[PDB]
Amino acid sequence: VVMTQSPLSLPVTPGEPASISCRSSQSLLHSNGYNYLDWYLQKPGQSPQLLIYLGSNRASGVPDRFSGSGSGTDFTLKISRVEAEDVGVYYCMQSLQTPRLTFGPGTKVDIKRTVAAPSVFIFPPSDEQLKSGTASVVCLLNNFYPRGAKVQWKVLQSGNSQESVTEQDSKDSTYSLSSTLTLSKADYEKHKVYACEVTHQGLSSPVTKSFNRG
Amino acid sequence: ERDRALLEVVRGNAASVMSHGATATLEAVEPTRAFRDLGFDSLMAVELRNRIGAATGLRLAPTLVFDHPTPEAVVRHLRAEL
């Protein structure tokens, strides 16, 4: 079975080119001298659209700045001019082997900016929901970049947390994370301290925030 | 009464500069119409500057036709520093 892999994310800026590379696990060059590979773009809120097919042949209506290149296993999509309209998810997807189970994780592309540490803010569970019969605690991160910072709950519960990520901001291209941990009333009143430990590439240390009410 | 007289003086000077020689255009300078809309350039701008300064005895900036495009704005500006 053929497997294709690309970088998970590649921050970019309008002002300097970029190149989304990806490698296959097999020589995609068919016997007819064509690399059976395609490149698609999916913008936020719009349907996916074709960019490149057979490695280098560009589709009509695509901007000329896009250009596919490479052969064998190694391929790349070079963009000369980066624009805010071109932010999205780029999928390099093979066609030598069929049927194709899935496109793959893709390669998120986002506006690059200066690194900023997150603003951690653990919030309390309001007494009204405690009497309602459910416990919920939310950890907040705001104004941080790049995404992918991992948050964990030490109480080390790892089966009751749900995370939500805001899209990249239009003004300052920031990101934000909100991780909510839910527990029952009997489950809530068992431990008298809950900590949120957050790790981010922009953080010098894993800045933890604790909360002790039980 | 001062504002009306100053507006009359500005209108007369603007009409005289706007005309090559010798009434129809005297009334064509209403207080609301912008001077640039009347087709004024740097040359006529400095001519109005000199004429208004001589009339009022006051040294004005060389762009007192587009900083205050309406004649009424020019009257307000003159009444300010006078």
Add this chain to the structure above:
Amino acid sequence: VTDSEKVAEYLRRATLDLRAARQRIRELESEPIAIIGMACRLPGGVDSPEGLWELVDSGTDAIAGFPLDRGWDVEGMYDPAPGKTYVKEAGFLYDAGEFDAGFFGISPREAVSMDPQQRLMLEASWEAFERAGLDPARQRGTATGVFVGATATGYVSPAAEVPEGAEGFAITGNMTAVTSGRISYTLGLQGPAVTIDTACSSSLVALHLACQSLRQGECTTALAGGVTVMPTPTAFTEFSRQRGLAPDGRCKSFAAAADGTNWAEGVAVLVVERLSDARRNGHRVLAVVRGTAINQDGASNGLSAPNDLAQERVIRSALDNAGLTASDVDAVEAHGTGTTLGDPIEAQALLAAYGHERPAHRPLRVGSLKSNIGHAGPAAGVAGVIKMVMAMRHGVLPRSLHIDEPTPQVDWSAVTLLTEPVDWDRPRRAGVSAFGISGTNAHVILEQAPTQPAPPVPAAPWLLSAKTPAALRAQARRLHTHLARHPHPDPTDIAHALATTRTPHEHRAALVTDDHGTRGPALAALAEGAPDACLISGTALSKGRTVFVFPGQGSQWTGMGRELLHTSPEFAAYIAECETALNDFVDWSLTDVLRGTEGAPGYDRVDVVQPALFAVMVSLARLWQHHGIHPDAVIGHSQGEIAAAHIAGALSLQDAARIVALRSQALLPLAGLGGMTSLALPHDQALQLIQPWGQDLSIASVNGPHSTVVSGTTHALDELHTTCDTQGVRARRIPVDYASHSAQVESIRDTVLQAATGINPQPTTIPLYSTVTGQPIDGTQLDADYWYTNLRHTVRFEETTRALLGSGHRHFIETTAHPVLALALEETIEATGSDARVTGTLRRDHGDLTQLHTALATAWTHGIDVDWTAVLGDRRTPFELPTYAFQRQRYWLEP
């Protein structure tokens, strides 16, 4: 999947992309350009292209004596040798010194200092834009090109110590580049402004450059034109030394009697764009320039001599560029200078190039515009293309004058001259040639434009506007004359064309009527300025913020909104929404009350009239907003404020309906206890007049500086009425059985607090002005206590109107069924000495679409922007309206 079907989809993608790229190439080199408009001023009284067509078709010879107002020594400079000329007549624009300096913003100083080439070219460009269905004022900021073929004929004479009068402007006013530059500067165009100096070929070369610029995407539209004026007669004197001018001044084009070439003036401009762009934008296509070519001769026998080889080569290049065989075209607008040297060479070139394999029954028909008006010069080719365009439009080739016999210098035995007019399976095509004296030969090929409803809105306004009242009268007269010669035009199409495809100038007028028997007399009365019933006139304000006004009671009459319910679907939808909101808090339906259904309550009852007034006012205001008049502020009057509170966004529809319905229901027990009386006096005079009655009476509302309503008990009200009759004060009793804005409402105070309970106020989206407080009020403050104070405390309409006028608001649109506060508003406006204009929506016994459009036209005439697309339509059939009626004045330089 199999490999074959897999590669099949890739092949399909590849060949589709191949077809797309090939089509891109085709539209990037051989793109047909569309002539969407044109405008010419040529000698012989011609002012429009239609003037040109009627001139040339009638065979009129537009050559007359030299002008006498230009300072020429015409009696002295005629001698049939040293420095004189032997011609006393040629094609002249005797109004060449006439120009509307004020319209374009130009000064008389700059205008007289400016070359008449520029003066003619500005007006020609404006008219060309107007004739294309485009508003020139809307062309500001567009990537529109300007390509003018002009030359420095010499009006200020830079070689002769330029005159004192034209000092400072003899560069800006006379550089040939500024001829093209000034068009873009005045119109605000962004595409390149390039002037071309090529002598007798500049205009067609400018058309070529405009075509190339449009094909490359550098421009969206383009102005391809030329101009020629003769400030001095030197062009006759210099060309008289050699026998080049005809002795009599007639350009005997291709005739045996060809003996010279008389010069002529003229301006001629085209507004053009890509054919695909024209089709997408829905512009009318007059003709299609398919291809163009330009070259040189170089190895000519003398610098100022022709060359048959070069002319044949440019003709073949133009044919190949358009992808057309020589036999495709069945007409040529030859240069036809009339010279003995030039005519045989041009005829030989045309015969060799075009007529070599044509059928034996369709000869190429050759003619020339120079025989009619003389040699236009720079503006020759762009006038010849206009002539061919109208020949294709009317399907008849006009005759070329003064051809007693075909010239014997060329073997005609393929090609025939247009001695007499000739009439016309395949599209009509025609060539035009603009061969120059500097050797730059040019040629274009034009083709007939390819072949290209909605219900008529009733009472469609006809809008007219102009810079000055005299120009407005001229516009009205021109439109009346144009409509007289037309077989039953569609009035809605005329309304759409007038509203959309013409600039809104300062002095405006409108005609609103639903019958095609009064518009003619109305246009006439506008022409001589007499008044008319269906005629509105006004001076639009340059700036000013808009106000919606919501009076209280009084603006009611049976049948209001009944006609609008059927005719206007938007009003019906808004009334339906109001009815759905009101249903839960009342025991009847709004539509039954408005339509006068059997058994529904009448407007006599207080509890039903106020909700009906609220619903009608809200629906009318929303209709105004739907027509594009978004208010900048809203003001109310007693219960009307609730409606205002809905339009401001502070109160939802449900909350406003609840407040008005429950407030009226809680006001029901007050019926019969007292009433209101409106007397015209100052507030202080009314206040000190009510002093003997004390708490019995009170100032209900201060509508204006001399209009106040006092509310109170019926006995005290009658006593005050008798006192006013004794004092001779015009006191009027309002038809109401309830004394609102008085102490009596305290008896129901708690119930009023129940009316506003449960509402959810929000901040105002539009600044709302409270008549209780007398200034803007935050939207969240509209609580139950506020509504009780509104019902109780005196209305201060005058104070809040004065404050609102102080805040730069200048338009007051009453959204009522009949104006009730317009008198007080106008009284306040004239008291404070402001220029605000008041308007109303409907009137008593007038609630159909005609009155609505009358109100909209009145608002537009006052200067309020109105989205006429919604009122009239998105796109109707194009209509050719007359161009602007310029009020010209003479501008010429004296020695």
Add this chain to the structure above:
Amino acid sequence: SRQRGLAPDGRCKSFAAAADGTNWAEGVAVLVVERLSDARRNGHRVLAVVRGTAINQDGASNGLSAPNDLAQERVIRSALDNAGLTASDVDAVEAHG
């Protein structure tokens, strides 16, 4: 000189704090240009290559003579786009000045 658009000292001090006008000058300057592919096929010594070019118009500026900033940057961007280059690919500029 009536427009006061000339340097009293006569020097055309471009982009200088002491600049106070311009000054005219005569001159002829011509280029014989050709397509790069044609030049290489014919072997002519290519002295340089214009890659992209663009022209536009100031429009409704403060005056007919006065310039327009937006139009200037727009034509610069259009020339770059026609050339297929970006702003960072240009080293110097022969300013009108």
Add this chain to the structure above:
Amino acid sequence: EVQLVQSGGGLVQPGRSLRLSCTASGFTFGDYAMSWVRQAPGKGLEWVGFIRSKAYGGTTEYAASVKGRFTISRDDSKSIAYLQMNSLKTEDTAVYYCTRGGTLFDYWGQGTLVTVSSASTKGPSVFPLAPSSTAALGCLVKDYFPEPVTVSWNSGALTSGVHTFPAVLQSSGLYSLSSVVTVPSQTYICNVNHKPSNTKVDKKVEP
């Protein structure tokens, strides 16, 4: 000009049939092999199935997870592609995309958001989040099945610093987003408006 327009979405409780129509206009529909490709919320693209052209035979193939349950057909006379989704499962919530070409998805439809779950319509239950004691405060919306639900701080007066996170589906099948604002270290109200339930809940957040 090629156009693909999808339709036939809407809420559906699990374990019934549904039809997704997708009309094509602007090309020869018969020759093309026609594909459906779904994309779950937050996940990557996942191909569902396709049908060959009538000339090839018109046979159908489907992804491994949709054997039998899903079906593809095509009305070539009027040129519509039909996806029949029989016995929907709770994890089939996605944005189904309609695409031309079996192996090369040159053009894609707007995509129909098909959401499937057993939850019925509920109204929101808004909880507060007290400020820490540079200051952040929020309110959390909980227990609302349908979407969308809007949150406005001070009735939309507050716009700077507001971060309305995307809704997340709990294991119970109920969505719960949360709105938060970073205030600069007066009263702070948040209003949750839920149109399917016509709810207009308001709440203060205070320490």
